[PDB]
Design a binder for this molecule. Sequence first.
Ligand SMILES: O=C(NO)[C@@H](Cc1ccc2ccccc2c1)NS(=O)(=O)c1ccc2ccccc2c1
Ligand SMILES: O=C(NO)[C@@H](Cc1ccc2ccccc2c1)NS(=O)(=O)c1ccc2ccccc2c1
Ligand SMILES: [Zn+2]
Length: 300
Amino acid sequence: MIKQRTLKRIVQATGVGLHTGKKVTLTLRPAPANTGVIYRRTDLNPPVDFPADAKSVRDTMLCTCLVNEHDVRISTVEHLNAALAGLGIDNIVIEVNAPEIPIMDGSAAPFVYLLLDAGIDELNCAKKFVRIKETVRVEDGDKWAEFKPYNGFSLDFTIDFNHPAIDSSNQRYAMNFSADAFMRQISRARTFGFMRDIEYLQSRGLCLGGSFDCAIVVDDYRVLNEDGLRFEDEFVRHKMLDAIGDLFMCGHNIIGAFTAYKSGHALNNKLLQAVLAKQEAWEYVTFQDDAELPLAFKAP
Ligand SMILES: O=C(NO)[C@@H](Cc1ccc2ccccc2c1)NS(=O)(=O)c1ccc2ccccc2c1
Ligand SMILES: O=C(NO)[C@@H](Cc1ccc2ccccc2c1)NS(=O)(=O)c1ccc2ccccc2c1
Ligand SMILES: [Zn+2]
């Protein structure tokens, strides 16, 4: 039987908060079967829990967050959420003593190492997958995102960004998902933005933790980071990283084929909600024998 996963032990790391520029301590905890992914703020008293749920996500001008009934938020969950999906972590409590997840290097890779430190523990309860049964498409002008039935998990993503540092040959990326492929191909791909935008935000007291150390920073013409890009198509790899995190907000790995053209956090969430809202488009499946598990979701 394919089992749900949590962590073996509690682990802690400290990083910089993108928004405040202050040190944030992140604690990852094992959790019981079926409890899912829970983000928790422990700066607040009492602490506030935000269960990961497609309906609780909000997108801002800067990042994604989860909100509670009172619109209290926890922010910058996008890249850690992608790492959870990548390693198939079903149940976990994620604490920060601050209003935001640390930005790390702008990618998901530092979170992967932290999760490896915590270890994986298999629980005695079947892991539930969401199987796509019908085609579902959502649109935003000329932008769109789609799920189709497919016995596996594939992503095919065309980026919305247009810049001299992005050739036409580097605007699309497609992959067959797996833990190893996520780690090797996607996890290290950084977020990105304009120097003038970062300077401007910082002049307004925002994004104080923003720097070359946590993003690809471009001007109108070129990548400014002295070491350049980690991949010739790093921008679109990062957008696939984001998509993997967006889709995992339902708390289940999905068996189907994902295709997107100029999508992003908002449209990816719209697709996820559209699927879950249409009863006949999907079903929960479990695997009592490891054989019939799509290759996509094998052990790391
Ligand atoms: O080919 C690879 N990377 O480019 C393997 C090499 C590797 C790299 C980093 C590791 C870090 C910690 C433990 C083991 C590692 C192996 N990377 S990978 O295939 O993506 C991979 C990473 C981590 C794993 C942990 C446990 C089993 C298998 C793993 C494979
Ligand atoms: O990739 C992300 N989310 O998934 C980034 C997107 C983003 C949004 C706005 C930006 C403005 C200016 C520069 C870069 C930007 C990136 N959101 S984020 O990881 O929370 C983030 C936001 C702002 C940053 C500014 C500077 C460095 C890193 C940043 C990361
Ligand atoms: Zn991102």
